[PDB]
Design a protein around this nucleic acid. Sequence first.
DNA 1: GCTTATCAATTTGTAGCACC
DNA 2: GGCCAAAAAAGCATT
DNA 3: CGGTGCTACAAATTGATAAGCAATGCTTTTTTGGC
Lengths: 96, 94
Amino acid sequence: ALTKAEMSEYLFDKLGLSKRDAKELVELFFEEIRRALENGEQVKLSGFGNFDLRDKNQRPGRNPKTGEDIPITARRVVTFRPGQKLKSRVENASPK
Amino acid sequence: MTKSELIERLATQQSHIPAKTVEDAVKEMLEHMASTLAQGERIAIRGFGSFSLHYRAPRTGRNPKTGDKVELEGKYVPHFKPGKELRDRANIYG
DNA sequence: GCTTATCAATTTGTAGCACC
DNA sequence: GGCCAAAAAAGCATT
DNA sequence: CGGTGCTACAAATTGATAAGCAATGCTTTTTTGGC
């Protein structure tokens, strides 16, 4: 699967950057997304998708193994909303 | 934060990296992530999250506005699963 | 208006990647 | 980096 | 450049609640490319 190592490589070949910069840039990229998210801000990457934050209240849950009913504590989760352009490029994808 | 705003922020911080280079990199990486998913391959970023593909069986859909039916072929859609760190840092509710 | 996703606790096999 | 008009993408409705 | 220990991660399991979406015309936001 695609990893930072691979991404760092493409940046090295295609754009000819030091393996140092091609490495840090990748990290910064995701770190900047994480940051924006932890600060409660929405991330909208045109051509790709949006990382929106939703605040979920508490709801009934349980222990899949046994069945012990346990309440899923309220929380704020990160969701991904892919745009059409991306959705179109994947709708006919063949799982490798 | 939009794609561009992302570039600006990254460009600002780094003083030893050309802004135009940051612009190219970001754009490239994303297009890289895109092609990957369109090739049927998943993305794995330990700590951040992972992008995969979920199958959508064929169904007799509808035109929500007119009500008319519409046959829909099987397809694949993107799916993201936030990594631990990402989940923790995002969840402000302790 | 219907289909798909969300999530609990626990185990088990896998793999990203920081650190030598 | 900024202005601006046009194109592209996304957002709305409701999705 | 390369081996590898640490752990995040994937898969699974049940069931109540939440989220997402088929078509498409019009609006709004973001990107683009010349200067």
